[PDB]
Design a protein around this ligand. Structure first.
Ligand SMILES: [Mg+2]
Ligand SMILES: [Mg+2]
Ligand SMILES: [Mg+2]
Ligand SMILES: [Mg+2]
Ligand SMILES: [Mg+2]
Ligand SMILES: [Mg+2]
Ligand SMILES: [Mg+2]
Ligand SMILES: [Mg+2]
Ligand SMILES: [Mg+2]
Ligand SMILES: [Mg+2]
Ligand SMILES: [Mg+2]
Lengths: 256, 222, 361, 42, 141, 122, 55, 110, 106
RNA sequence: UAUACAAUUAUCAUAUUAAAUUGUUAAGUGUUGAUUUAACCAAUAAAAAUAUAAAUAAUUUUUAUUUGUUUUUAAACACCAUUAGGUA
RNA sequence: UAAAUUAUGGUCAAUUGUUAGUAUUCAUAUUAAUUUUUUUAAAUGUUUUAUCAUUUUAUAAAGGUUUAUUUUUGAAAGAUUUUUUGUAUAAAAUUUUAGGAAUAGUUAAUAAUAAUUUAUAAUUUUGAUUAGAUUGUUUUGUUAAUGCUAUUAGAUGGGUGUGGAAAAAUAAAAAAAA
């Protein structure tokens, strides 16, 4: 009586059920708008997906833009942690320490034998790619999820110097994965989605934490604005958490 | 049109932004003091006319004789070369420039702008008189005549004067615009136009002329 | 006491003046009908800063020294000595460029003369009109793309902004000259044009002009009617700046376009490339979305922890589906706009709706 | 007659009257412009 | 100057310049210079309705030389096809073919000028020849 | 025959429209003002009329004063049959205006006309 | 002109046709064609401070 | 101005008649205008237009029960508060207060 | 041009039927004829327009209705940023190419 | 009852590219009385002078702004009433 | 910025009032109509069937609607031993009154939610909603002609919801299972 007789959002045909079934044999009931609920609402993001053989092996090193000291980002993420922990303190193991915040430009697997040839060669190619690029001012607002809501990150908006990043990345992508064959978890002809990972659930953690980060935590910060940052520093990092208190850094390039 | 302020009529042959002369807000005319030389006071002044009569002279080309050296030594000043000619020249009109409407029209009254008539006061030439010679001596100006090299004005003038416009509008009889023509009812004018090479005809241009000449000559009405 | 009353004795040409009497001095409107009682503190600051004097920025001396280091070298040898050759001519390309002394007399030309003369050509001796022209020339110079630029949008916008302020404070003093009311309104209109062309040429300069001279009041869309029809945004179509953006420096174009063969929108290809374009949200949209995101968690918790309440509500819904107006979906029932497609029922048979149109169509 | 219809000074060239009629409703019906949404003639 | 007024076209006042300059028996007219205007002039000069014409590559205007015979002009009437720019008349080949026919006798007496899709300014006679339709400009005779 | 059919090949009339975004007060909904054409055969001339549409932008990109491409689609809500297909011209000034916390566009000074005289002073 | 439409005079017909004329149609410049005068001087005494959120 | 300049069409002469009106016609219409105006004066007409009300519809105050001239005809129905205020307006319009601007007075205004 | 050509009841004055096939496919109407509510008043709209006038397919070069200046083409040129005028060099409304069209091979 | 305005010039009420706005000057007492008016009546009589240049042309002011009604007579003329006053 | 010819081609545009100084489509004309005349309609009982039942037989009652009316094959056609499919309900244009103001079970998001979910909502002066008149987008008359001037009729809510589809309560002129 307060709206349409048949609300338009409720008109749904399921074509993944056989024809004739719903007319005679039985009726099928489901809450159908959990599935139809879109990629903007859920906060999912489609990352470059790995081929199965690459999907098998752990990633070892990654490219990163290092966040400078005195960031808008780091500050606001600290504020966000405060708020989240005051709401639910079950988040505490999920959250990444503000010390480890960095922009992830791509991920890669390096085998341990060819290690030095690869790090030297990579470092060199990287330095050539970024030779001409001056520092990058990028904008961060919004949250998103990788790997079925297990990884919770801060989006990099394509409103700014981001454009340049995309060419820049796509060049190293075509060198590191194209030229010297290296395992980039995706195709070298495809571009990686840059992100700042905030909360994460590792395999070991998953038992006590659960299989997905409940959206009730970060729902309100989903579109929150973390601000602008200029970035001069590119790293190639191996992931060791006890060597310096920051991800162990195998290579570096200065944008100037 | 019997309405006052509509008397100036419909003239299209003016240069203004309306074909209706009486909506034009630029030049308000003066019916009492105007039209000695132009006939009616409605019509455009001698120097602003965009349409020309058969036996009347058209506008003088402004100079701003040295360049006639090739011509008849006796030939004097060509009638159409003038030192001072202004297509934009404000003619004094009382209702515009001297406007008595807001007054009782007593002898001194009415508002006057002096920007129209050139000042006949001695104040100007006294106040500006300098030991440095004038603009012409100093040659401050760039450019020159706006059309560049002009046979009458800047450069010298060779050949013949066309005082009627007869050669100036003719139709090229050729794809190359080498040969041009002017046809009256019973007469035909074929004019060779190659001023650059001194009227020296090429093989193509000559073989063309022998066509235009006999097609003009074997015409019915010539 | 309560509404004004016009009294009209119909044999008379016009009514008698109203009883509350109105304000004795008529309000001064801007072009759009908005009221200004006085200059805003910013504009006031602009005129107070024009009045006592202007100055040439040492910016010009600097670029003069870097561009033509020889001439500046000469003037640097000759300071205080009378000069017979004007080496400084490159510093002042135009007549208008020299405002620091009257009659466009450059500073270093006064070197060899009397100090009395120096005081007689000073700023303090300018007329008010001259002072306006001074402020205008200074600002025109700071926003100009080259020396002789006039007609370009930034310049135009600035000079019209200044003219507008002048006329405004003028009208503040002597109330009725409606000639200048009209000239102020026309100037304001041409300013509106100039600014709206600016924001599509270069927007930061547009911003800083609005912030310097405090004209945001003439950028406000006049009335809701013509705005709702999108004729406010239709202006920069007519100006030819609508496509002028040159995206690639801003807004990576990959997620602004839809797929022709696929049919998927721009939000879809943005989804697929893992990009997010989203306008910054106010608190409305944020708290709506953050309220909606959580529906299923709230629901799961409800039907786990409290099954009886749920089953009650469900009883009501399920049984409702059998009661009510229409039990099945047909063209009649499934008409998205019921009152619209059947208007012929609205007075007599169908009493639910009192009007045939609740939306655009 | 200030209150009444405007009259032409002379006639109108009939040929021009026929030239300005090219896009008129009849020619359009012949071109097929209007959609046929109803039964029309029987 | 206002809304109700017609929207003038270089063709409109080209025709009226020529008409008025013909009524005052002038030898030369200075007239607006656009593509279809000097097109119209070349066509009129073809048919001999005009003594001559020239474009000086002056931007605004060019000049036409009028022809008189037996004391009155060679032009009875000259009229533009449209009063506005907001109205555009299209001439079917059959229409332009009707003009040519006076109750069974072939009549080229009156000339009609028109644009083509090919940007040519043509009389109706060549148009009918190649069976192309065109947009109307003016009639003259 | 107008601009819209000039640029597009439409499967069905009105399947494509180009317009400006006027207002976003509704989540995932952009209102769009669009022009179309009417012909008067008596006077042989065209007029442009204008019409508003509700378009569905998932993900909320459209800022008031965007030039957008719009398409016909599935019935979405009571009044939305159109979705935003592409942003032709975004509003850069408006977006930066939002980023600073201000409204995209200043709110119109006067509303709809009235037949009364409102005396409201100070 | 059929005499039953609009007023009893003829010119009433052409006065309502001017309402449909193509070049006379309502737009962003020409507005309120049918009642201009009911809306005249309506906001004179309505004092509205203009909208500035930028300095 | 509110009231009508003319009554009926006062400029009817042939086209290009080089005056707005002829003497004859203008005299006829001057007669009709005269009669109407005289009617307004003697019947003591009063109109009002109030703020925040539809303006085209003017309350006729000369027909109000207090200010009504006739002893017979039923006058009009206007709100009690509003009508009190109208009566006060009409009353305090009458006489010149010093410092106020002098406004034309008549017998028929009362 | 006469009254007899006003009567479209002749088949010689009327765009033929088959056009509606050529647009929507052959034998497409046999579907529509069996529809529930038909011909009271309305039938599924029958599109017959001479194929050289089709708005869908054709453009400014082969169709005279597109090259009408003052409403379609004026807007288009304002948008694309070409210089334009009433009587222009190009068939449609435009004196010259825009900057983009001059600097880019398409 | 149906059955073809003008568009080159048309006088009553739907304006629109415009340079204005602001100026502290003058005038007044000797003496015994028919001035003004076609004619009446009241009853000191003298007076208020200065500004050009400059403002750029067009494209979204039509709910905005605008077309000889105006504080102060303890200052007159003038006008209206008639010696009482009104207005200026 | 040059003419053109291998010559009438690509199939018909053609206006008829005897007025009364002059200005302005206005009495008396022709064509088309109503005035005007029983040579085209028609009467009731639909029909099978397995028996108190069940199969076949789907748009002429009225009301007055101008952002308005939109849809499938599961019936029949229909072919064949049994299962078989997908496409549909949505829109865009065109919309009347001489003197013109506000409208409302109400928008959008959520969802098989909410007689109190969330929100800075929706329609309107580019003319709304009520209210008058009116049966909407191949049909006529006049005319040399852009015009002017006609076109009927037929879809009027729900309440054990049958049926493929509500079109389901006299009023055919549709052969309805030998
Ligand atoms: Mg609807
Ligand atoms: Mg009703
Ligand atoms: Mg009087
Ligand atoms: Mg007809
Ligand atoms: Mg008027
Ligand atoms: Mg006074
Ligand atoms: Mg029925
Ligand atoms: Mg109704
Ligand atoms: Mg519709
Ligand atoms: Mg619909
Ligand atoms: Mg019932």
């Amino acid at each position: 009586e307060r709206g349409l007789y048949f609300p338009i959002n409720h008109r749904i045909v399921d074509h993944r059920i056989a024809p004739g079934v719903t007319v005679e044999e039985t009726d099928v009931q489901s809450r159908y708008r959990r599935e139809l609920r879109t990629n903007f609402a859920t906060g999912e993001t489609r990352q470059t997906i790995a081929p199965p053989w690459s999907a098998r092996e752990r990633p070892t090193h990654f490219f990163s833009l290092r966040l400078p000291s005195r960031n808008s980002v780091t500050l606001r993420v600290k504020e966000m942690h405060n708020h989240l922990l005051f709401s639910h303190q079950q988040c505490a193991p999920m959250l990444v320490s503000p010390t480890k915040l960095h922009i992830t430009l791509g991920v890669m697997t390096i085998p341990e034998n060819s290690r030095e040839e690869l790090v030297k060669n990579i470092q060199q190619s990287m330095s050539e790619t970024f030779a001409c690029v001056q520092p990058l001012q990028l904008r961060f607002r919004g949250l998103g999820t990788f790997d079925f809501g297990r990884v919770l990150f801060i989006r990099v908006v394509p409103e700014a110097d981001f454009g340049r990043l995309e060419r820049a990345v796509c060049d190293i992508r075509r060198r590191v994965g194209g030229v010297l064959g290296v395992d980039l978890k995706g195709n070298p002809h495809d571009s990686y989605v840059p992100h700042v990972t905030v909360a994460k659930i590792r395999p070991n953690q998953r038992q006590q934490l659960g299989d997905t980060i409940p959206q009730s935590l970060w729902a309100d910060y989903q579109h929150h604005d973390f601000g602008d940052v200029t970035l001069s520093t590119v790293d190639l990092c191996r992931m060791k958490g006890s060597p310096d208190g920051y991800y162990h850094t195998e290579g570096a390039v200065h944008l100037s | 049109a019997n309405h006052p302020n509509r008397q100036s009529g419909i003239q299209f042959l003016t240069h203004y932004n309306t074909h209706q002369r009486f909506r034009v807000n630029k030049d308000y005319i003066d019916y009492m003091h105007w039209g000695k030389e132009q006939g009616q006071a409605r019509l455009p002044h001698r120097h602003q006319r965009v349409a020309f009569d058969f036996n009347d002279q058209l506008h003088p080309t402004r100079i701003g004789y040295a360049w006639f050296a090739s011509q008849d030594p006796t030939f004097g000043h060509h009638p159409d070369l003038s030192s001072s000619f202004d297509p934009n020249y404000r003619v004094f009109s009382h209702p515009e420039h001297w406007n008595k409407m807001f007054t009782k029209r007593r002898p001194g009254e009415g508002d006057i702008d002096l920007s129209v008539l050139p000042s006949r006061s001695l104040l100007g030439p006294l106040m500006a008189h300098s030991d440095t010679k004038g603009i012409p001596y100093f040659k401050v100006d760039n450019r020159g005549h706006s059309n560049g090299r002009v046979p009458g004005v800047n450069a010298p003038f060779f050949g013949e004067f066309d005082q009627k416009m007869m050669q100036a509008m003719s139709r090229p009889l050729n794809a190359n615009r080498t040969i041009t023509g002017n046809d009256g009812r019973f007469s035909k004018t074929i004019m060779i136009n190659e001023p650059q090479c001194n009227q020296a005809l090429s093989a193509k241009t000559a073989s063309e002329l022998s066509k235009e000449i006999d097609k003009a000559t074997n015409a019915v009405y010539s | 006491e309560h509404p004004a009353i016009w009294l009209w004795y119909p044999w008379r040409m016009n009514p008698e003046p109203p009883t509350p009497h109105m304000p004795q001095r008529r309000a001064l409107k801007n072009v759009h009908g908005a009221v200004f009682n006085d200059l805003t503190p910013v504009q006031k600051k602009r005129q107070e800063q024009m009045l006592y004097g202007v100055n040439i920025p040492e910016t010009r001396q600097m670029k003069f020294e870097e561009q033509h280091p020889l001439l500046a070298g000469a003037l640097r040898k000759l300071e205080g000595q009378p000069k017979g050759f004007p080496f400084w001519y490159r510093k002042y390309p135009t007549r208008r460029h020299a405002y620091e002394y009257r009659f466009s007399i450059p500073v270093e030309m006064l070197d060899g003369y009397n100090d009395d003369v120096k005081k007689a050509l000073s700023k303090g001796m300018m007329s008010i009109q001259e002072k306006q022209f001074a402020q205008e020339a200074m600002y025109m110079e700071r926003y100009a793309e080259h020396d002789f630029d006039t007609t370009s949008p930034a310049v135009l916008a600035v000079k019209r902004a200044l003219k507008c302020r002048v006329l405004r404070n003028h009208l503040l003093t002597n109330p009725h000259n409606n000639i200048i009311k009209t000239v102020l309104a026309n100037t304001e209109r041409k300013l509106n044009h100039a600014l709206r062309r600016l924001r599509k040429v270069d927007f930061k300069k547009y911003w800083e002009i609005i912030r310097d001279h405090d004209v945001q009041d003439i950028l406000q869309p006049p009335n809701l009617v013509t705005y709702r029809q999108g004729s406010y945004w239709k202006y920069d179509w007519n100006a030819g700046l609508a496509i002028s953006t040159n995206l690639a420096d801003v807004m990576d174009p990959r997620g602004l376009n839809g797929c022709v063969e696929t049919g998927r929108s721009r939000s879809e290809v943005a989804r697929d490339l893992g990009l997010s374009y989203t306008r910054p949200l106010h608190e409305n949209e944020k708290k709506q979305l953050s309220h909606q995101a959580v529906y299923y968690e709230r629901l799961a918790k409800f039907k786990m922890e409290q099954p009886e309440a749920a089953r009650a509500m469900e009883r009501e819904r399920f049984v409702r589906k059998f009661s009510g107006m229409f039990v099945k979906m047909d063209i009649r029932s499934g008409a998205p706009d019921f009152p619209s497609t059947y208007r012929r029922l609205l007075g007599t048979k169908v009493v639910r709706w009192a009007s045939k149109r609740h939306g655009p169509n | 007659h200030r209150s009444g219809k405007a009259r032409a000074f002379v006639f109108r060239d009939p040929s021009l009257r026929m030239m300005r009629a090219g896009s008129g409703y009849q020619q359009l019906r012949r071109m097929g412009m209007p959609m046929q949404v109803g039964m029309g003639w029987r | 100057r206002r809304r109700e007024e017609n929207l003038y076209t270089p063709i409109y006042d080209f025709c009226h310049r020529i008409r008025e300059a013909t009524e005052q028996r002038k030898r030369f007219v200075v007239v607006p210079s656009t593509i279809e205007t000097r097109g119209c002039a070349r066509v009129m000069h073809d048919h001999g309705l005009v003594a001559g014409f020239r474009d000086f590559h002056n931007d605004r205007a060019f000049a036409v030389e009028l022809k008189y015979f037996q004391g009155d002009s060679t032009i009875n009437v000259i009229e533009p096809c449209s009063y506005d720019g907001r109205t555009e008349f299209e001439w079917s080949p059959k229409m332009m073919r009707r003009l040519l026919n006076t109750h069974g006798i072939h009549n080229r007496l009156v000339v009609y000028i028109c644009r083509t899709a090919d940007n040519r300014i043509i009389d109706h006679i060549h148009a009918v020849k190649e069976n192309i339709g065109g947009r109307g400009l003016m009639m003259v005779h | 025959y107008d601009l819209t059919s000039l640029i597009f090949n439409q499967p069905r009339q009105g399947s494509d429209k180009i317009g400006y975004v006027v207002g976003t007060s509704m989540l995932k909904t952009a209102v769009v003002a669009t022009n179309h054409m009417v012909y008067y055969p008596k006077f042989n001339q065209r007029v442009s009329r204008t019409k508003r549409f509700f378009a569905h932008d998932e993900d909320l990109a459209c800022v008031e004063g965007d030039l957008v491409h719009i398409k016909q689609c599935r019935k979405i809500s009571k009044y939305k049959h159109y979705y935003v297909f592409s942003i032709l011209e975004p509003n850069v000034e408006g977006r930066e205006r939002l980023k600073l916390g201000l409204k995209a566009v200043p709110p119109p000074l006067f509303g709809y006309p009235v037949s009364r005289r409102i005396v409201k002073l100070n | 002109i059929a005499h039953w439409y609009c007023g009893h005079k003829f010119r009433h017909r052409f006065m309502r046709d001017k309402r449909f004329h193509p070049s006379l149609q309502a737009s962003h410049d020409a507005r309120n064609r049918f009642s201009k005068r009911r809306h005249f001087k309506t906001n004179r005494w309505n004092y509205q401070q203009a909208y500035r959120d930028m300095p | 101005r509110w009231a009508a300049k003319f009554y009926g069409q006062v400029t009817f002469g042939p086209r290009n008649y080089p005056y707005p009106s002829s003497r004859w016609l203008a005299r006829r219409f001057q007669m009709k205008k005269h009669r109407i105006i005289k009617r307004f004066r003697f019947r003591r007409y009063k109109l009002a237009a109030v703020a925040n009300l539809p303006f085209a519809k003017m309350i006729r105050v000369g027909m109000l029960p207090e200010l009504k001239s006739s002893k017979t005809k039923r006058g009009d129905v206007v709100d009690p508060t509003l009508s009190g205020q109208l009566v006060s307006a009409v009353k305090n319009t009458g006489e010149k207060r010093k410092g106020q601007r002098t406004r034309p007075k008549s017998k028929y205004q009362v | 041009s006469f009254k007899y050509a006003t009567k479209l009841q002749h088949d010689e004055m009327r765009q033929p039927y088959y056009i509606h096939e050529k647009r929507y496919g052959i034998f497409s109407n046999e579907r529509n004829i069996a529809k529930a509510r038909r011909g009271l008043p309305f039938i599924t709209p029958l599109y017959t327009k001479h194929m050289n006038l089709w708005d869908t397919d054709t453009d400014a070069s082969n169709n005279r209705f597109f090259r009408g200046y003052y409403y379609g083409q004026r807007e288009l040129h304002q948008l694309l940023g070409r210089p334009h005028s009433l009587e222009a060099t190009n068939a449609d409304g435009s004196n010259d190419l825009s900057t983009y069209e001059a600097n880019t091979s398409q």
